[PDB]
Design a protein around this nucleic acid. Structure first.
Ligand SMILES: [Mg+2]
Ligand SMILES: [Mg+2]
Ligand SMILES: [Mg+2]
Ligand SMILES: [Mg+2]
Ligand SMILES: [Mg+2]
Ligand SMILES: [Mg+2]
Ligand SMILES: [Mg+2]
Ligand SMILES: [Mg+2]
Ligand SMILES: [Mg+2]
Ligand SMILES: [Mg+2]
Ligand SMILES: [Mg+2]
Ligand SMILES: [Mg+2]
Ligand SMILES: [Mg+2]
Ligand SMILES: [Mg+2]
Ligand SMILES: [Mg+2]
Ligand SMILES: [Mg+2]
Ligand SMILES: [Mg+2]
Ligand SMILES: [Mg+2]
Ligand SMILES: [Mg+2]
Ligand SMILES: [Mg+2]
Ligand SMILES: [Mg+2]
Lengths: 266, 22, 155, 141
RNA sequence: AUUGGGCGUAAAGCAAGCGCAGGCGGAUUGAAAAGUCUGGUGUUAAAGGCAGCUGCUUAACAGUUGUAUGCAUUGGAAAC
RNA sequence: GGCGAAGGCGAAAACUUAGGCCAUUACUGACGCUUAGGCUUGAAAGUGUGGGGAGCAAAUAGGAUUAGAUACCCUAGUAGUCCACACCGUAAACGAUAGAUACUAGCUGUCGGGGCGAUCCCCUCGGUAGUGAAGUUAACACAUUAAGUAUCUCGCCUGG
RNA sequence: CUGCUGAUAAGGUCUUCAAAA
């Protein structure tokens, strides 16, 4: 099968956030509460939702759809998306999601066409560039690459979106919903279930759980486009992973003291 | 009267089923 | 053959550091007279560009309309803000008993015989919103049969 | 069946049930409970027959002194109900009596009208068939 | 605004309370039948209104047939 | 932050006395909600008679400022502010939101009773606050203490 | 770091239009 239930339990993909931060509409994916303070999930629901999303993304990638991976979150998520893009040639937006990346696609298409033209001009090279103008062109290349390096490949609106956190990507999921594009996400007890189509009840704070699930989706894509897989349909000795640096791991949401009353009074 | 306990506890079910070409 | 007609052409303006910026706003209703109709309001410095943008918005936002015997199935009241529009089914022959924004919406949608009355405000955009809400809230007599497990509108 | 919370009901039997049903519909709630009266039992029987509810179930205390009725709404798979609205006609104070000639047709026959003529509550169509009318309780569509 | 409106900021919740009369009012059983529903009967003058037709060169108009509403009495229904 | 229906209530004590919250295997057995008319209370100012008068201060006098100052500033200053007994019955008397009843996500505090027993913290029943989706609204916003879904009763509104 | 500091005759343009290219 896809994964092992004890493996999910060990990667802690069945722990959400503190009970304080939760959307009541996500009560379906949480079993009746208990002395746990971090909103444990239902493992069968996790596996079922993951299998459904896997099947859909596999179908899209086999039928040659264009999927876009979006993480503009912690540096680990950024590097994870970059590695997944290296593994499979899917489009990605690791930097900030630009306003209207999908609903205003014409202007960003103009920008990426300009980026491609500048890139080929620089590659063709010329002695007229000298030093100053060459440096300015290189800096422009660097900026449009940092902000459009994953979008340059596509020429048309993508057929599917994969979001690491719908709460953080509220703009991206809103654009996907207004354009009627499928969007899958790793909901983490604080997300509105209506916006996401293929909900995957999961963790979003654990750098091991997010890595495992993101690599599972990438494994679906890579199997559909036919390379050897990475995590899916694999034993423990190859599924095992490490915990990034910098007793047990602490998925506790803290720092409530930085939420003061809005400036008021007269 | 009318009790059958159908159980329809599948909220937020996926709408899209399978991608296809024209 | 998506026919279009102009419902309102207002002259809106803002004030700047000396003088007034004046722009024309158009409320266009686009309908194919077969079941597709949308509305679009746009603002521009000139009437032609305003009309072009309004038509673009109306074609971008199109809604599906179902007709029964050329009319509306059941009496409905569309609410939008302070405008309430009452629609009532009519027998074949009375024609359109609507006037103004409701008449434009009904003709461009494709209905033949409708009784209408504007019970509230007379601002074209809100009247159009109320009319669209009333027509959209409508229930076909097959969805209710599916819901209640009846036999395709049989007694 | 065992309960934990106290159960209360309004003095008006038709509009109590209507408020419960409308609030449950708007809030997507499925199961609700209320105090049981025979008018409410008959009206829920006709709602179940017409297919606006899944089930209604009456229960009695161990001492046979109190009765409560609990019913569930009929939601589809995508979780949208079959009830679209409820409106009560014969409110307390102003009671509405209409003969057969003026028996109403709700939403051109899509909805139903609850009429308690002489043989308990009765739907509009069967009242028309029997050619007799009476008190009109509520409009449900 | 009975059908068919409102009272935080646009006109409109008495400064607040104790409250007679009035209005409304928990659940079950029985009786009667004042309200409610329904059948028969009498009447609601003619003209007028609506539908059909005839005659004025057609019409306006005239004539002719049908056409309700309420009250009373009597016989049933018993859900509210 | 607490109490009362509102006005309102803050040094200590005694006496007399009103209501409320929680749990009830107890009792009466619909005796309830609202309330035209009626009655009771009702900040401050004001009135009448008798007391009291430290401080403050309408009216009043003077010095300043000012084109003028019958005002803002200052120095004095009577009624009044205080008590008892009788009236007046008005306030932005405001939550600008009548009372009663049933239902409708959640999160964070705080106050009281009850369950456990160091505090702290957990649960239940209520009071008082903030944030907040459905829902409502012309918008601001209200949002289980509703301005939401509905019922009952009273009062009130109909351009300046 | 609080001095002082008052007034401004009447009536008025200015959007013609989208039918459309
Ligand atoms: Mg200037
Ligand atoms: Mg009005
Ligand atoms: Mg006012
Ligand atoms: Mg008040
Ligand atoms: Mg007042
Ligand atoms: Mg009382
Ligand atoms: Mg009384
Ligand atoms: Mg009763
Ligand atoms: Mg006559
Ligand atoms: Mg005649
Ligand atoms: Mg005084
Ligand atoms: Mg003087
Ligand atoms: Mg001055
Ligand atoms: Mg002095
Ligand atoms: Mg005096
Ligand atoms: Mg007053
Ligand atoms: Mg006060
Ligand atoms: Mg608020
Ligand atoms: Mg006047
Ligand atoms: Mg000076
Ligand atoms: Mg002067």
């Amino acid at each position: 099968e896809l994964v092992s239930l004890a493996k999910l339990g060990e990667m802690r993909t069945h722990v959400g956030m503190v009970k304080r931060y939760w959307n009541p509409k996500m009560g379906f994916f949480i079993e009746p509460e208990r002395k746990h303070n971090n909103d444990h999930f239902v493992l069968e629901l996790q596996r079922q939702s993951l299998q459904t999303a896997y099947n859909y993304v596999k179908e899209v990638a086999q039928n040659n759809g264009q999927i876009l991976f979006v993480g503009t979150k912690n540096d680990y998520v950024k590097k994870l998306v970059n590695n997944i893009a290296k593994r499979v040639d899917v489009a990605f937006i690791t930097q900030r999601w630009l306003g209207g990346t999908l609903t205003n696609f014409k202007t960003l298409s103009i920008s990426i066409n300009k980026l491609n033209k500048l890139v080929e001009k620089q590659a063709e090279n010329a002695a007229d560039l000298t030093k100053k103008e060459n440096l300015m062109l290189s800096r422009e290349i660097e900026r449009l690459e940092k902000f459009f390096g994953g979008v340059k490949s596509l020429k048309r609106l993508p057929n599917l979106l994969i979001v690491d956190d719908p709460v953080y990507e509220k703009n991206a999921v809103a654009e996907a919903n207004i354009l009627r594009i499928p969007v899958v996400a790793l909901c983490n007890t604080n997300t509105n279930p209506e916006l996401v189509d293929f909900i995957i009840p999961a963790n979003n704070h654990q750098p091991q759980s997010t890595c495992l699930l993101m690599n599972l989706l990438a494994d679906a894509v890579a199997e559909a486009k036919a390379m050897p897989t990475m995590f899916a349909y694999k034993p423990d000795e190859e599924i095992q992973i490490e915990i990034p640096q910098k007793k047990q791991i602490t998925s506790q949401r803290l720092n409530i003291t930085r939420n003061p009353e809005v400036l008021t009074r007269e | 009267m009318g009790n059958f306990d159908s159980v329809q506890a599948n909220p937020y079910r996926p709408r899209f089923k399978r991608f296809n070409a024209e | 053959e998506f026919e279009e007609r102009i419902v309102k052409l207002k002259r809106i303006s803002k004030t700047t550091k000396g003088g007034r910026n004046m722009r024309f706003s158009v409320l266009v209703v686009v309908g194919n007279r077969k079941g597709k109709i949308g509305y679009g309001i746009a603002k521009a410095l000139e009437v032609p560009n305003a009309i072009k943008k309004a038509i673009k918005a109306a074609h971008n936002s199109l809604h599906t309309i179902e007709i029964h015997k050329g009319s509306i199935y059941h009496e409905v009241i569309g609410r939008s803000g302070a405008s309430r529009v009452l629609l009532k089914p009519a027998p074949q022959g009375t024609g359109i008993i609507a006037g103004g924004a409701i008449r434009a919406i009904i003709e461009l949608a494709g209905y033949s015989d409708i009784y209408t009355k504007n019970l509230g405000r007379n601002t074209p955009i809100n009247m159009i919103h109320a009319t669209m809400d009333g027509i959209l809230k409508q229930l076909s007599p097959r969805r209710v049969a599916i819901l209640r497990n009846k036999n395709l509108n049989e007694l | 069946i065992t309960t934990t919370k106290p159960i209360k009901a309004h003095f008006d039997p038709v509009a109590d049930l209507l408020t419960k049903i409308n609030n449950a519909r708007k809030a997507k709630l499925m199961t609700v409970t209320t105090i049981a009266s025979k008018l409410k039992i008959a009206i829920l029987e006709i709602l179940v027959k017409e297919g606006y509810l899944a089930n209604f179930q009456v229960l009695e205390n161990k001492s046979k002194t109190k009765r409560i009725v609990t019913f569930n709404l009929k939601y589809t798979q995508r979780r949208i109900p079959s009830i679209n609205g409820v409106k009560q006609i014969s409110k307390p104070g102003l009671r509405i009596y209409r003969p057969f000639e003026k028996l109403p047709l709700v939403l051109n026959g899509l909805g139903i009208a609850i009429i308690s003529t002489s043989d308990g509550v009765m739907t509009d169509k069967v009242a028309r068939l029997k050619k007799i009318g009476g008190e009109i309780l509520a409009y449900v569509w």
